[PDB]
């Protein structure tokens, strides 16, 4: 059964899925990817004069409640 395998993973949707939560998942995954790779974090820390620790803290803070409150 394929549907049990996909149900457990976090991020998968279904027919009754709204757009806000889909983009919330997109944003959370994007923040985690930014934290993961190194040279992308270097890019972000050079584009604005902030230490990498500050950028990491800001990204972690934005993980809670992105894209505004729900409807």
């Amino acid at each position: 059964q394929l549907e049990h395998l996909q149900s457990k993973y976090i991020g998968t949707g279904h027919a009754d899925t709204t757009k806000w939560e889909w983009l919330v998942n997109q944003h959370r995954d994007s923040y985690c990817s930014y934290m993961g790779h190194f040279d992308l974090l270097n890019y972000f820390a050079i584009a604005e004069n902030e230490s990498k620790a500050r950028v990491r803290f800001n990204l972690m803070e934005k993980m809670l409640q992105p894209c505004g409150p729900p409807a």
């Binding site: 993973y9 976090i10 991020g11 939560e21 919330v24 959370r28 995954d29 985690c32 990817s33 934290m35 993961g36 790779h37 190194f38 040279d39 270097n42 820390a45 050079i46 230490s51 990498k52 620790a53 500050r54 990491r56 803290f57 972690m60 803070e61 993980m63 809670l64 409640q65 505004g68 409150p69 729900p70 409807a71």
Partner: protein, 396 residues
């Protein structure tokens, strides 16, 4: 039309710079981690020059790096967490001049994912267990042990999952031959995703949680969970057991706090501010990295600020109860992403952007001209000045 990729110069940007005894001798080496290059360095203990011995390439994104040694052992190991869904233990060979893979275990898919561990790599101070965690919901514990043939072994992973949680930092707690314990800076988001008004996003605070590994029952259970005041960014391990007390130092914006489970009133000390600072008063102030120099006589911490000031934290305690935290200004160096203090009196500064420097500690900076600051004293200021407790000997 086929092309052939070649390299003339490898990356020279340090990301993790753990240290230890890897050659099995009395000399200490530094294992630095570039983006995808694993390199091992040996500073000269007589002329101060830094030399390179191995520059292997791993073809992957290294996300975490820590070292440990088994109790009664002499040679340290290397633990690597990366984008591959595996944990790998390495071991240096001075004779062959190479890294040998001792163990590897698979626990999930590949790539820098949200719910696949590999971000945090806390290890037990004695060497009895290791922990790998994800940013969300995934934590696995492995138990290390030795056999009759003097070889390390690994057990099956133990799961400590938790739904709808985020992890800021994970560190191992020095418990002194008791059940190994791990402390994490968790934070929940279940309710905030269910409040249209949006006040539930506010009033949500971090909780410091302790995970105790039950060796007798072979399972992990969380015991303590206390809400915090500010939002911490990273934790520090306090040497406990026979020397010093247990617990963890929590670093937040404009504060540093000591906490411990069971029965302890926490102690908070504000971070000193630079005198005649030109910055906007709106912004806060945080620490970026730290270090530890535990020794038989005493132990002290080091900490780096955003501006680039090195403090010297000393804990003052009763027979077993801690009383206050004493901060003192040590020196100022370029901002770094990792610092390490070795024996023989050397400081290695791995700058996060630019050249790297090696300093020799000539004075420990005690009872000098500058005053000290304490949590018992009822916004401190200090005057930065050129180097007094450091001498530069090498530049990379």
């Amino acid at each position: 039309m086929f092309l052939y990729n070649l390299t003339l110069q490898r990356a020279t940007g340090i990301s993790f710079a753990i240290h230890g005894n890897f050659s099995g001798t009395k000399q200490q080496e530094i294992v630095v981690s570039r983006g995808k290059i694993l390199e091992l360095l040996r500073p000269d203990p007589n002329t101060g020059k830094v030399h390179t011995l191995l520059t292997v390439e791993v073809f992957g994104v290294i996300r975490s790096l820590m070292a440990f040694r088994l109790t009664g052992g002499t040679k340290d190991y290397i633990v690597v967490g990366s984008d591959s869904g595996r944990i790998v233990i390495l071991e240096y060979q001075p004779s062959k001049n190479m890294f040998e893979k001792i163990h590897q275990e698979t626990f999930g898919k590949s790539g820098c994912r949200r719910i696949v561990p590999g971000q945090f790599l806390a290890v037990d101070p004695k060497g009895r267990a290791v922990m790998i965690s994800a940013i969300e919901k995934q934590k696995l514990v492995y138990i290390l042990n030795r056999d009759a043939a003097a070889r390390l072994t690994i057990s099956s992973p133990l799961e400590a999952h938790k739904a709808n949680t985020l992890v800021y930092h994970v560190v191992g707690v020095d418990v002194g031959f008791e059940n190994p314990m791990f402390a994490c800076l968790e934070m929940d988001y279940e309710e905030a995703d269910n409040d249209p008004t949006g006040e539930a996003a506010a009033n949500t605070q971090q909780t410091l949680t302790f995970y105790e590994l039950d060796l007798g029952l072979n399972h992990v259970v969380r015991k303590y969970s206390e809400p915090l005041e500010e939002h911490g960014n990273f934790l520090i391990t306090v040497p406990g057991g026979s020397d010093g007390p247990s617990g963890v130092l929590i670093c937040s914006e404009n504060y540093i706090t000591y906490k411990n489970f069971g029965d302890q009133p926490d102690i908070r000390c504000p971070i000193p501010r630079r005198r005649n600072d030109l910055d906007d008063p709106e912004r806060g102030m945080i620490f970026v990295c730290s270090a530890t120099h535990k020794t038989k006589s005493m132990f002290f911490f080091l900490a780096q600020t955003e501006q680039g000031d090195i403090f010297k934290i000393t804990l003052e305690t009763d027979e077993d109860m801690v009383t206050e935290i004493r901060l003192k200004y040590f020196d100022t160096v370029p901002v770094a992403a990792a610092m390490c203090v070795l024996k023989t009196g050397f400081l290695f500064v791995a700058s996060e952007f630019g050249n790297h420097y090696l300093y020799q500690i000539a004075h420990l900076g005690d009872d000098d001209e500058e005053p000290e600051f304490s949590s018992a004293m009822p916004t401190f200021f200090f005057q930065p000045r050129p180097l007094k407790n450091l001498v530069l000997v090498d530049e990379l």
